[PDB]
Write a protein that binds this ligand. Structure first.
Ligand code: OGA
Ligand code: CU
Length: 289
C-alpha cells in the first residue's frame, strides 16, 4: 500500500527473437513461455478509484457485495446466484440493456511454487488449478471477440446483438483481501493499435477426443519506457470489491476498446496464495446502433 511499484512485466517477444504465438492456457508449458521483459511502473490507485472508468480508461474498481463465499467449486458457482448478482451490478454500472454472464475462471495457485512443483512435468500437462496470469494480454482481440460471441451465444442472438453496441468485460474479485500477486490494468489510451498482435489461445480440454478450445487474444508489444504504458492497480482489494476490465467494445470512436492487464508480484507479497474469480460477461446496449 505504497504509492507505486516498479516491477518487471512480461511483454510480447517477436518471433524473430525466438517467440511463439500460441498461448497454451492452463498448461505447464505456458509457465515456461518466453517473453520480452520490461520494467514498468504501476501506480497504486487505492483512494483514487473515482478517477477511472470503463469509457475513458477501460477499467473500473467498484464496491459490490455478494452473498457467495466459496468459489473453487465450478458447479456450485454456475448453479448459484453469483452470475445473476454480477449481471445486476454490471448492468447498473454500464447502463447496459442486457448482460450475458458466460462463465468464470478460478485462480488460487502460487506462481513460483507451481513452477517448482511442475519443473519435471511435460509441457502439455494441465495444472490442477490455475496460477496468476503473469503476462500482459487482452483476453479477446477484435477477431477473438466476434469468435466468442458466436461460440457463447446462439447463432441468431449473436447476429441480432451484433447490430447494436456490445462489449466484453471480465469482473475480477478476490476470494479475500489481496496480500500477494495483485492485478495490474493498463490505460487503453496509452497503448497504440500497432502494439497489439492477434495471438491464438488454446486449452487442450478432453484431448485427444476434442480439438483444443479456441480463443484469440491480444499480445502487447514491449514499451521503450517504464511509464510509456500507464499501469494501475488497487492495493488491498477485498471480496467486497470487483475490478471491471473491458476486453472489447464494438464502438470504435469515443470509448476505450481494450485493456492490457497482467498479474504481478510485489516484494511485499505475503500470505497464503491469492485466490480470485474472473467472470466473463457480454454487455449489450440495444439502444445504441
Ligand atoms: O488474476 C489473474 O492473475 C489474471 N486474471 C485475468 O487476466 C483476467 O481477469 O482476465
Ligand atoms: Cu485476463
Amino acid at each position: 500500500e505504497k504509492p507505486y511499484y516498479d516491477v518487471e512485466f512480461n511483454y510480447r517477444l517477436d518471433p524473430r527473437d525466438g517467440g511463439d504465438e500460441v498461448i497454451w492456457g492452463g498448461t505447464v508449458g505456458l509457465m515456461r513461455r518466453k517473453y520480452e521483459t520490461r520494467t514498468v511502473r504501476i501506480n497504486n490507485e487505492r483512494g483514487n478509484e473515482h478517477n477511472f472508468n470503463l469509457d475513458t480508461h477501460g477499467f473500473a474498481w467498484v464496491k459490490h457485495k455478494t452473498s457467495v463465499t466459496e468459489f473453487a467449486d465450478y458447479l456450485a458457482i454456475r448453479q448459484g446466484p453469483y452470475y445473476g448478482e454480477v449481471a445486476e451490478m454490471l448492468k447498473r454500472v454500464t447502463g447496459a440493456t442486457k448482460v450475458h454472464v458466460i462463465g468464470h475462471l478460478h485462480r488460487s495457485l502460487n506462481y513460483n511454487d507451481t513452477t517448482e512443483e511442475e519443473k519435471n512435468a511435460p509441457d502439455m500437462t494441465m495444472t490442477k488449478g490455475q496460477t496468476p496470469g503473469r503476462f500482459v494480454h487482452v483476453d479477446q482481440s477484435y477477431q477473438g471477440a466476434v469468435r466468442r460471441l458466436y461460440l457463447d451465444l446462439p447463432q441468431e442472438e449473436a447476429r441480432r446483438l451484433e447490430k447494436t453496441r456490445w462489449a466484453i468485460i471480465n469482473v475480477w474479485r478476490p476470494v479475500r483481501k489481496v496480500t500477494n500477486e495483485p492485478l495490474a490494468v493498463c490505460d487503453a489510451r496509452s497503448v497504440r493499435e500497432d502494439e497489439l498482435f492477434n495471438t491464438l489461445h488454446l486449452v487442450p480440454m478432453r484431448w485427444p477426443d476434442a480439438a483444443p478450445q479456441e480463443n484469440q487474444m491480444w499480445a502487447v508489444a514491449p514499451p521503450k519506457t517504464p511509464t510509456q504504458h500507464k499501469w494501475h492497480y488497487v492495493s488491498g482489494m477485498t471480496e467486497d470489491e470487483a475490478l471491471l476490465i473491458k476486453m472489447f467494445d464494438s464502438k470504435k470512436d469515443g470509448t476505450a476498446r481494450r485493456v492490457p492487464h497482467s498479474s504481478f508480484p510485489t516484494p511485499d507479497d505475503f500470505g497464503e496464495p491469492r485466490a480470485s474469480t474472473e467472470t466473463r460477461c457480454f454487455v449489450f446496449w440495444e439502444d445504441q446502433e
